[PDB]
Predict the 3D structure of the following.
Amino acid sequence: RVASGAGLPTSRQTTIMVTKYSEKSPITIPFELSAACLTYLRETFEGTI
Amino acid sequence: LSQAGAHSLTPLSMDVIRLGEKTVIMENLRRVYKNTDTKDPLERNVDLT
């Protein structure tokens, strides 16, 4: 506030209270594998090169 | 009045300009009226007819 001269209107005390909120935005991405890839990853047959 | 002056003096930083062997201080009073109700008396209206 600024003090005023005699006779002028004066400034009232003022309190301002404010609230602020958050926001949400998720992301995603897929990846895929083949049945043959999983078969050879999980198990092995008669050992060969 | 002159001998009533204060004795101690403090240093503080400000900008000056040279105007023909005359140095003057430059200031803006934005700080004083930053969020107050009073208007800056250096911002004025002018009428032309």
User: Anything to note?
Assistant: The two ends of chain B are 46 Å apart (CA to CA).
